[PDB]
């Protein structure tokens, strides 16, 4: 405890008062004097048709040329976005996959899912074909996302209410991050690769530290499970989209909310969120068969990225900002511009 | 096209390989095996031969069956049950001996699911002899206070079947029922002809004649 419960309650009241006293004004009251982006139309420059089942993940390469896609068909195929050609066709041990990753050096491809095993694939092998490099297995829940810190360290978000950092050299969990109550279903590493956040199913996103291994911040402003998350390119802000048909923007130093991207016409949830190079545009995937274009400073719909025949599962933006890719459930990977 | 012609040839070759793999894998039948804990899942999956998902596949009467016992996933169902669409049918196992409201709630939640609105559910009832002996020892109204009727084995079993079959609301999906006593080896034929019936129904629905 009763004393411990009261201590926790007064600590919550204290942190709430601290974050409330520093909120002089909202973002919408300070960006009023900027010119809106207007109608931002985009056209399907390329339509890549390679798969036969639902596509869940599609990550751009570091060179902004190769895109790797994942699907229930058990194939993780890397594609040449420029000329639509197929360069690899990697069969997977478990056909149930939910995420994929591309190494910053381009030598490694990761993919995991319900199998509870994060598989690491070696691309540039002297023997020709692609062979498995390691089978990381230390999670009791389904892996939901994977990101490569470098050629050795990889951070994975699992479905058993924790996130762990791996070492591909030995396959052992160097550091584990615990504290979430709901299922963690999203992950995004910082541009400086020194910290990251994880989106859980308890409507709470927590900042993390890869080196120290201790949680730094927590954010409680959602109503349902958080489905996607992505950092602002500046590295000091991030936006998370949930199943409550809205995506909100947070700030690391402010430890509060900035904007809520809610429209009365939209009722379906969020499946993917991604920014642009300048960070002005926030391309968000929706379960309403379309991907609304969200301005990050005025909270208005610049345009609709419609054209898919099923719900989109992943949206990614190239490192040079010249294209955006959307992966849907109709086995089509349309690359827009 | 100086050197990229060989790249085009490689792309076409692997596209042909993908087409062949898709054609080969389109012949399989996907059956999801759900239910409560220790309710005969292990004995039924071992009946037809052969850490998160335990996929068991076997061939019966020129038909390739695939079972995915996903009950071992200690997480929220709603976050990964959406990937189990396009299955021919859902196999549900109920342990009548041990009680009971959890199984009924799970069946209600799975039969009215948005993704499984059209997929049929095959209901399996196990431990017939134990349930009969328990009737011979105890009344069947312990977990059914609203029940009012004779304590006969057949009548009680029919009542339980009615409670399961009164949870559906979609005319398109039909629930198939069966009795098992953990000593019958003919349960494969029920799965087989249920799968054939569901195949016929889906084929008629696709062609527009249904």
């Amino acid at each position, epitope marked *: 405890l009763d004393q411990l419960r009261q201590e926790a309650e007064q600590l919550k009241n204290q942190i709430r008062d601290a974050r409330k006293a520093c909120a002089d004004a909202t973002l919408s009251q300070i960006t009023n004097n900027i010119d809106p982006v207007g109608r931002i139309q985009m056209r399907t420059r390329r339509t890549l048709r390679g798969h036969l089942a639902k596509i869940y993940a599609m990550h751009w390469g570091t060179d902004s040329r190769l895109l790797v896609s994942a699907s229930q068909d058990g194939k993780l195929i890397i594609w040449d976005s420029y000329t639509t050609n197929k360069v690899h066709a990697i069969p997977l041990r478990s056909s149930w996959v939910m995420t994929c990753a591309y190494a910053p050096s381009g030598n490694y491809v990761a993919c995991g899912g319900l199998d509870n095993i994060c598989s690491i694939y070696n691309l540039k092998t002297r023997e*020709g074909n692609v062979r498995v490099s390691r089978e990381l297995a230390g999670h009791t829940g389904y892996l939901s996302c994977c990101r490569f810190l470098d050629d050795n360290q990889i951070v994975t978000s699992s479905g058993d209410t924790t996130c762990a950092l791996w070492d591909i050299e030995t396959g052992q969990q160097t550091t584990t991050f615990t504290g979430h109550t709901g299922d963690v279903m999203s992950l995004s590493l910082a541009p400086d690769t020194r910290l990251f956040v994880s989106g859980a199913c308890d409507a709470s996103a927590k900042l993390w530290d890869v080196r120290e291994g201790m949680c730094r911040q927590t954010f409680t402003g959602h109503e349902s499970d958080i489905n996607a998350i992505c950092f602002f390119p500046n590295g000091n802000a991030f936006a998370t989209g949930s199943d409550d048909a809205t995506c909100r923007l947070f700030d690391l130093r402010a430890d509060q909310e900035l904007m809520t991207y809610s429209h009365d016409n939209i009722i379906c949830g969020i499946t993917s969120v991604s920014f642009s190079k300048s960070g002005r545009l926030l391309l968000a995937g929706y379960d309403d068969f379309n991907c609304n274009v969200w301005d990050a400073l005025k909270a208005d719909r610049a345009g609709v990225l419609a054209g898919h025949d099923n719900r989109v599962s992943c949206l990614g933006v190239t490192d040079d900002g010249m294209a955006v890719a959307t992966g849907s459930w109709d086995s089509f990977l349309k690359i827009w511009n | 096209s100086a050197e990229e012609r060989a790249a085009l040839e490689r792309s076409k070759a692997i596209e042909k390989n993908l087409k062949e793999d898709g054609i080969s894998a389109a012949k399989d039948v996907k059956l999801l095996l759900l239910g409560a804990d220790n309710s005969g899942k292990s004995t039924i999956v071992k009946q037809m031969k052969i850490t998160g998902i335990v996929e068991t596949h076997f061939t019966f009467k020129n038909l390739h069956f695939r079972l995915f016992d996903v009950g071992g996933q200690r997480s929220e169902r709603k976050k990964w049950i959406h990937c189990f669409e396009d299955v021919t049918a859902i196999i549900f196992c109920v342990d009548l001996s041990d009680y009971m409201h959890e199984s009924l709630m799970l069946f209600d939640s799975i039969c009215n699911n948005k993704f499984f609105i059209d997929t049929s559910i095959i209901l399996f009832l196990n431990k017939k002899d134990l349930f009969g002996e328990k009737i011979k020892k105890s009344p069947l109204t312990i977990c059914f206070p609203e029940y009012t009727g004779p304590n006969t084995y057949e009548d009680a079993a029919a009542y339980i079947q009615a409670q399961f079959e009164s949870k559906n609301r979609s005319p398109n999906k039909e629930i198939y029922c069966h009795m098992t006593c953990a000593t019958d080896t003919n349960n494969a034929q029920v799965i087989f002809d249920a799968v054939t019936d569901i195949i016929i129904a889906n084929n008629l629905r696709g062609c527009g004649l249904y």
Partner: single-chain antibody
Amino acid sequence: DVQLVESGGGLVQPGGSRKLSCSASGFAFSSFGMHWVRQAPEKGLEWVAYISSGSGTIYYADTVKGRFTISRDDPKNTLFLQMTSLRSEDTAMYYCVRSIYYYGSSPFDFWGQGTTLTVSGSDIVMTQATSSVPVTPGESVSISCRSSKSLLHSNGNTYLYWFLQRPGQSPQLLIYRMSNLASGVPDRFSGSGSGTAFTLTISRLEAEDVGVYYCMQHLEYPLTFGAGTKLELK
């Protein structure tokens, strides 16, 4: 490990026929491509034949077309070369070369040991004026290779390979596509080129870098070699 071996080499009576076999092991041969290159006992290298992945397309040189036959037995993991009507100009050092073609691949990465056989117009021509450059270790030596037609393709890739053939050994790849470096080769080697003139800049020469160099173009078949530039001690 990766390794290539060839068999079926010996003196042949003039006007006869003989089969050549390239055996491969240690890698997935069914997905790769096998080339063929001859080397005269006094002159340099020369392109012979090709078969693509899956036996799709087969090419030949002008002076060998209509008399040879290149076939692949993928399950047997061997490369074949049927050659007939032995004239006096066919005696040379015949090598077997692996190649794979996709985005970012390195064709001609591995070369075979080679076999010995003894018998008693619009093509792009490769030329290099310097055929003997004496130099002591520790200095920087640059080797040139000029082109009759520009090798810069519309997509931005210049197909001007560089190869080094140590005495008593098989040729090895140093720089492919005139700008990208090989795998495992020391970082001292470098490449450059623009349109027609290409230079293979080398820094901090050592004793193991001696030999004779060869520059290849890859814009269109046949794949014509150069005369050869020799780097020697002192």
